[PDB]
Amino acid sequence: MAKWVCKICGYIYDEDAGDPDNGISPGTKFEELPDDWVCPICGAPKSEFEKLED
């Protein structure tokens, strides 16, 4: 699946890994993350992520 980078801190949200410590099971697409999920490292909102492709 896809990877998305936090443009603020460099954390990579990997859809294959999810974010289980914050309620997100592996295989959860970025678009399916709750509206109030934030970067687990820096707290940035979803708006600050970019998909790693193209």
Binding mask 3-22 for Fe ion (x = CB under 5 A): ---x-xx-x-----------
CB of 42 to Fe ion, least distance (A): 3
30 in contact with Fe ion (CB under 5 A) = no
38 in contact with Fe ion (CB under 5 A) = no
Q: Residue 27, annotated ligand binder? A: no
CA distance 34 to 52: 20
Residues linked to residue 49 through DSSP beta bridges, in sequence order? 6
Q: Residue 38, annotated ligand binder? A: no
